[PDB]
């Protein structure tokens, strides 16, 4: 990696993106982005930060970053360990779970969900599976 691939089916109410992998032993950060490849908009930007232990997420829309959402109930990533991330897309929001526990919801900023057709993953991670 960096991993950058086409979603074989674009996002919509009820669509899923599953990330399985291993956060590096000496990791500091990694990113999984849900892109609208046509305008280069990042509708969903999940950025777990191992060093400060914060799950950051934002949207990069019209060449400009929005307001940041950090609110978590627990930090589900730990260096040297395997994680599974399920990203579920609902009508009004994304729902993200990590390792069988609910992590966060994220209201849709990029409203035209069918235009989200790209997945990008980079950072201090070892990618096992994208589904």
The answer to whether 20 and 98 are in contact (CB under 8 A) is no
What is the enclosing helix (H) or strand (E) of 60?
Answer: strand 54-61
Largest Cα–Cα separation, the chain: 38
Q: What resolution, expressed in A, was reported for this entry?
A: 3.0
70 known member of a binding site: yes
93 known member of a binding site: no
Q: Angle at Cα 72 formed by Cα 66 and Cα 74, nearest 5°?
A: 150
105 known member of a binding site: no
68 known member of a binding site: yes
Ordered domains of the chain (ranges, CATH): 1-131 (2.60.120.200)
112 known member of a binding site: no
Residues in the chain: 131
What is the rounded distance in angstroms from the CA atom of residue 6 to the CA atom of residue 77? 26
**How many C-alpha atoms does 38 have within 13 Å on its Cβ side?**
9
């Amino acid at each position: 990696m960096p991993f950058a691939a086409r979603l074989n089916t674009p996002m919509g109410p009820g669509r899923t993106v599953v990330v399985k992998g291993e956060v590096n032993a000496n990791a500091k950060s990694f990113n999984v982005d849900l892109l609208a490849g046509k305008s280069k908009d990042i509708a969903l930007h999940l950025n777990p930060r191992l060093n400060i232990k914060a799950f950051v997420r934002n949207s990069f829309l019209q060449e400009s970053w929005g307001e940041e959402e950090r609110n978590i109930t627990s930090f589900p990533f730990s260096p040297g360990m395997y994680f599974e991330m399920i990203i579920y897309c609902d009508v009004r929001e994304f729902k993200v779970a990590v390792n069988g526990v609910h992590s966060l919801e994220y209201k849709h900023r990029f409203k035209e969900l069918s235009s989200i057709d790209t997945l990008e993953i980079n950072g201090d991670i070892h990618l096992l599976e994208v589904r």
